[PDB]
From Swiss-Prot:
GO CC, any one term: virion component
Catalytically driven reaction(s): RNA(n) + a ribonucleoside 5'-triphosphate = RNA(n+1) + diphosphate
UniProt name for this protein: RNA-directed RNA polymerase
A Pfam family matched in the record: RdRP_1
Lineage: Viruses, Riboviria, Orthornavirae, Duplornaviricota, Vidaverviricetes
The organism of origin for this protein: Pseudomonas phage phi6
Length: 664
């Protein structure tokens, strides 16, 4: 039922994706690569002392701090939700093979009994009202670009000057390119303005993944991660196979001469896609103003900063339901892309812009290297973008796409199962807009706090409260999916955007508190996704610019965890056993070095200014800017710190661009 066309790298269609420069040519050909990450300066993830430390610490913490999660997935007591074995991976060595990305998710959705469009007219009005509220009265802002980020297809440039030129040119030529696509001239739009082509598939590490200790055998078992072979990916699952990837690390001894201690595994690998920058720039120019609107006008539902900021909202609720979505990005529906596009056209958005946006969500994918002697294949034809991959991670508005889908999905779930008395308030578009505007501001008896696939659903006192409890019970029973749109369940150990909701004996939101997840501290400190990149001179371009700074924000971030002190003491004791050194002193030295190095990057910071004016968010972000892509936003970071990590195209160029996109 329609296989996607596939082209080898040798084919002209794949060759056209890579410009005549060394960087682009190397990206096309990049073979499967693996190796130990430089966890910290002069320390490898596979260092025998480091692995010995991880073995002792993971075993000790699991033993002394067993999970405290009730029958309803509510965290209590110690604030622990699982064992601590997730740290037991040979960081930098992936599971083999990684998945081939699914070219079509239509069969995947149908087989999971998920809808191929809005079920009812009410749902249709709500998805459309979400578009009207999110995209209406936007204000132009500079187009911000992450320093050291790639332009991907076709140039693969990491230079800021080149990136600024590409972005400015893209805003100037977006109209001409969009109009060519409207005429079906995709190859022309790509050849002239580099708008089209494909997403470039990079495989990123998920450094920690589930591991259990079998009491019967005393042997560790890693969570099986299902992967699709080429045949399965091109046929959308009609043909080929879905099988467990190999996380067995035994191979490292034979291949590399690395000693593999018992119960250490290869890392889970996730597909990540880099968009063609010329196509992304005009999308980003609209996406940022949308985020600014939703994080201001609809801050209740969408703007999440601190554990206390989240706590203030949740404490007012009579019931809090922490939801879980199965494989959000791969299940994301193409019918929603089409509904959004149709609604933007109805609002009066430039048709050429809507076409660029639509095309960004149908684009072919270039598969690099999922395993040795595999990959280097383009899936889909760039001459006619028609893929149904779900949500591409490198699309200019992925966060908004997931947020739009999920916010409405959860509201529908609350309406269907708890609040039929509110259905009368949604009769047409104006009434749907008025209702959603009120709901998103937290003004209804049914409420929510969400970001993409993470959410907490709330009920205050009223008619919907009883229904709220039945819905929670249906989730606990786990026999019926409460949504027609996505696979929803309850989170086992309810958390929101990294903060665990810690309940007491009462098991009520009013007496529950948000605390930092101590397991995330361990993930970040001992299992970073990337190495220190000590060879990259410009620290602002590194994936981990100032790792030492995280020590200064630790107490602020994790201090509220019941076992915070216990974990720090266990780390100190285990690090002494493994290295014969103080971990605290080691981190204090790294903090000093990185504080000194930071002043070189901040114009306002005198040669030895100190961390005085910096917030805990600023420190966490400087140590890990990936937190700025999933946890926080630009407005949460001090202006002088945002400038370290980002650079922008003038608001004058974006202001002119935005005027041409937006309705009259
Ligand atoms: N701290 C941190 N979090 C990450 C990182 N990468 C991804 N995440 C989070 O990982 C989550 C992924 O949820 P999934 O694993 O796909 O859910 P699933 O497909 O149903 O599989 P399960 O893990 O069994 O639930 C997302 O919500 C991400 O934000 C990272 O590098 N660091
Ligand atoms: Mg959650």
């Amino acid at each position: 039922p329609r296989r996607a066309p596939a082209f080898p790298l040798s084919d002209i269609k794949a060759q056209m994706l890579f410009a005549n420069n060394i960087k682009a040519q190397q990206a096309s050909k990049r073979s499967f690569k693996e190796g130990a990450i430089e966890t910290y300066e002069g320390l490898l993830s596979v260092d025998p002392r480091f692995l010995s430390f991880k073995n002792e610490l993971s075993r000790y913490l699991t033993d002394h701090f067993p999970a405290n999660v009730d029958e309803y997935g509510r965290v209590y007591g110690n604030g622990v939700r699982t064992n601590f074995f997730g740290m037991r991976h040979m960081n930098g060595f992936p599971m083999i093979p990684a998945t081939w990305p699914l070219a079509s998710n239509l069969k995947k959705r149908a087989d999971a009994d998920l809808a191929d469009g809005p079920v009812s007219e009410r749902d249709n009005l709500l998805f459309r009202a979400a578009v009207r509220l999110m995209f209406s009265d936007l204000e132009p802002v500079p187009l911000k670009i992450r320093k050291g980020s790639s332009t991907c297809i076709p140039y693969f440039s990491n230079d800021m000057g080149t990136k600024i030129e590409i972005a400015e040119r893209a805003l100037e030529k977006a109209e001409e390119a969009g109009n060519l696509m409207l005429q079906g001239k995709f190859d022309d739009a790509y050849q002239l303005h580099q708008m089209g082509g494909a997403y470039y598939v990079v495989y990123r590490a998920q450094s920690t993944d589930a591991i259990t200790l079998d009491p019967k055998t005393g042997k560790f078992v890693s969570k099986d991660r299902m992967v699709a072979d080429f045949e399965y990916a091109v046929t959308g699952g009609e043909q080929g196979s879905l099988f467990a990837a190999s996380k067995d690390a035994s191979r490292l001894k034979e291949q590399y001469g690395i000693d593999v201690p018992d119960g250490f595994f290869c890392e889970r690998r996730r597909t990540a896609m880099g968009g063609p920058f010329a196509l992304n720039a005009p999308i980003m120019a609209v996406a940022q103003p949308v985020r600014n609107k939703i994080y201001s006008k609809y801050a209740y539902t969408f703007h999440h900063t601190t554990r206390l900021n989240k706590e203030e909202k949740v404490k007012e609720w009579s019931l809090c339901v922490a939801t879980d979505v199965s494989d959000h990005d791969t299940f994301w529906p193409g019918w929603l892309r089409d509904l959004i596009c149709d609604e933007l056209l109805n609002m009066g958005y430039a048709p050429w812009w809507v076409k660029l946006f639509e095309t960004s969500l149908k684009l072919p994918v270039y598969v690099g290297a999922p395993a040795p002697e595999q990959g280097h294949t383009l899936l889909g034809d760039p001459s006619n973008p028609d893929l149904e991959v779900g949500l591409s991670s490198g699309q200019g508005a992925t966060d908004l796409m997931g947020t739009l889908l999920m916010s409405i999905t959860y509201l529908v779930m609350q309406l269907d199962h708890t609040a039929p008395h509110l259905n009368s308030r949604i009769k047409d578009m104006p009434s749907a807009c008025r209702f959603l505007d009120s709901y998103w501001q937290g003004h209804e008896e049914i409420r929510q706090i969400s970001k993409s696939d993470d959410a907490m659903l709330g009920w205050t006192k009223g008619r919907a409260l009883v229904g709220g409890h039945r819905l929670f019970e249906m989730l606990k029973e786990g026999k019926v999916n409460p949504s027609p749109y996505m696979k929803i369940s309850y989170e086992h150990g309810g958390a929101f955007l990294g903060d665990i909701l810690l309940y007491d004996s009462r098991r009520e939101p009013g007496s529950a508190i948000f605390v930092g997840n101590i397991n995330s501290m361990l993930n970040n400190q001992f299992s970073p996704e990337y190495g220190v990149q000590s060879g990259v001179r410009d620290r602002s371009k590194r994936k981990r610019p100032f790792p030492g700074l995280a020590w200064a924000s630790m107490k602020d971030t994790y201090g509220a965890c019941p076992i915070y002190s216990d974990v720090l003491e266990a780390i100190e004791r285990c690090w002494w056993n493994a290295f014969g050194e103080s971990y605290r002193a080691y981190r204090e030295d790294m903090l000093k070095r990185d504080t000194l190095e930071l002043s070189r990057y901040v114009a306002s910071m005198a040669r030895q200014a100190g961390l005085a004016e910096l917030t805990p968010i600023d420190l966490e972000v400087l140590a890990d800017p990936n937190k700025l892509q999933y946890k926080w936003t630009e407005a949460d970071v001090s202006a002088n710190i945002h400038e370290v990590l980002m650079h922008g195209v003038s608001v004058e160029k974006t202001e002119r661009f935005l005027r041409s996109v937006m309705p009259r």
